[PDB]
């Protein structure tokens, strides 16, 4: 530190005294992030393991709100043949929130899954289900021949093929009106140019891949001016104490040391500031306790040395720090036989003004030579 003092004072000769040279700070180790426990899972399990399934003409719509959408539980299974999504990619839908979710579920033919593609116009893509001009979701589909196929077949599933005009978006028209044509209007009967819109599905093991029943669930995310309610899951790491780190508590970002406290916060209170309008204490979102934030240690660096003519022995003073953080606060990385010897050793003394290294504490009292603070003086003479 004699070299640092010479560089700061811009003089190779240093007079007897104390001089401030630089500053030291403590940096966060890696990071800390915390969030409340995830206990508001959306009821996707009921849809995944539904006992009864709805027909196309009665495709079922489900409202999803005020719950966390954890799609990883179904994504890791990878048991769905069709995993197409639009608006947001499946691997990056976690980092954005929506205020509502529509879940439309039905069972169709295996080759008709493409008919559920957004914006398609066709016999099934217009006359059974319609979609708006914007999509922010998925059109997931999977095979359902294991459960929906049984001996003897089923006739409770109907599809619409004939209708007057295209369906209005987000409408489920459950009607049995017979289609009529202007060339020959039956007007009350099912004669020429008049047929039932709905035909029954054919369930049998001999059906091919295209004819095999497939369960299709289309999910549509949506956000409006109203506050968002369906947010993706946020991972919270382990909580560390008595260590300087950059912490993120419920979106509040700070840097410092989190230490256990005895403050009794109100049940509705999350954090607590001080008179100076700075964050002081934080409640752990997962488990209930209060942690105070110490704004690191930092401080000033002062060099204690006599005149260069007298000798070259030097001492190091750190301001407002305990004698435990000195080897970590930007240290032990400089040149070894010069700086590393002035960070640790048996000459470390703790004073009210901070930590002093390079001087020996003696019970005797003499006239002050180099003042430090709080009635502390360093002298080169023994």
């Amino acid at each position: 530190p004699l070299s640092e003092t010479k560089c700061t004072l811009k003089s190779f000769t240093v007079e007897k005294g104390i001089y401030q040279t630089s500053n030291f700070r403590v940096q966060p180790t890696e990071s800390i992030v915390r969030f409340p426990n995830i206990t508001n899972l959306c009821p996707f399990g009921e849809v995944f393991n539904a006992t009864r399934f709805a027909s196309v003409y009665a495709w079922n719509r489900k409202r999803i709100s005020n719950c966390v959408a954890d799609y990883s539980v179904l994504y890791n299974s990878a048991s769905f043949s069709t995993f197409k999504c639009y608006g947001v990619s499946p691997t990056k839908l976690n980092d954005l929130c929506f205020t509502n979710v529509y879940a439309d579920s039905f069972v169709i033919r295996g080759d008709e899954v493409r008919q559920i593609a957004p914006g398609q116009t066709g016999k099934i893509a217009d006359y059974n289900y319609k979609l708006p001009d914007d999509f922010t979701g998925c059109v997931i589909a999977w095979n359902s021949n294991n459960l929906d196929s049984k001996v003897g077949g089923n006739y409770n599933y109907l599809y619409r093929l004939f209708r007057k005009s295209n369906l209005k978006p987000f409408e489920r028209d459950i009607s049995t009106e017979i289609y009529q044509a202007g060339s020959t209007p039956c007007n009350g009967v099912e004669g020429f140019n008049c047929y039932f819109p709905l035909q029954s599905y054919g369930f049998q093991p001999t059906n091919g891949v295209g004819y095999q029943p497939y369960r299709v669930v289309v999910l549509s995310f949506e956000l409006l001016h109203a506050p968002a309610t369906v947010c993706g899951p946020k991972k919270s790491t382990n909580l560390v104490k008595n260590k300087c780190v950059n912490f993120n508590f419920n979106g509040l970002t700070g840097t410092g040391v989190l230490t256990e406290s005895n403050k009794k916060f109100l049940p509705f209170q999350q954090f607590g500031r001080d008179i100076a309008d700075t964050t002081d204490a934080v409640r752990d979102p997962q488990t209930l306790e209060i942690l105070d934030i110490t704004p690191c240690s930092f401080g000033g660096v002062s060099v204690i040395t006599p005149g260069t003519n007298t000798s070259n022995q030097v001492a190091v003073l750190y301001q407002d720090v305990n004698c435990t953080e000195v080897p970590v606060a930007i240290h032990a990385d400089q040149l070894t036989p010069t700086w590393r010897v002035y960070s640790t050793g048996s000459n470390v003394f703790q004073t009210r003004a901070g930590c002093l290294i390079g001087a020996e504490h003696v019970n005797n009292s003499y006239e002050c030579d180099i003042p430090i603070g709080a009635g502390i003086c360093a002298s080169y003479q023994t």
Partner: nanobody
Amino acid sequence: HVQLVESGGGLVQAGGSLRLSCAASGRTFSRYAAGWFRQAPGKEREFVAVIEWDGDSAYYADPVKGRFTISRDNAKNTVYLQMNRLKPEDTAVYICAVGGNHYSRSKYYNLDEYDDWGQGTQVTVSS
């Protein structure tokens, strides 16, 4: 009724550049992911390129990797395929399809995963 029209094709000299424009007329063009495929006599049908709604991420086949560019324009409801450093082996009929966004690599070889099918345009190289 999203009508698809193809233009910009024809016969071009070797070593030049080409631009094939596929225009889709409809109210759901933005919801469609644009796929481009090629077909040549004596060769099996192979997937060429696919681009999403925003166009930031696009997927191209290995034989045509790093050789052609794809772009979109929602305001004009058009998609453009730029061929650079053209070769005589690229003389073929190109087809543009709109509808559905796919993420499976093995599912890009099927033309049944798109809503509407167009007519395509012929690209020929003169030596």
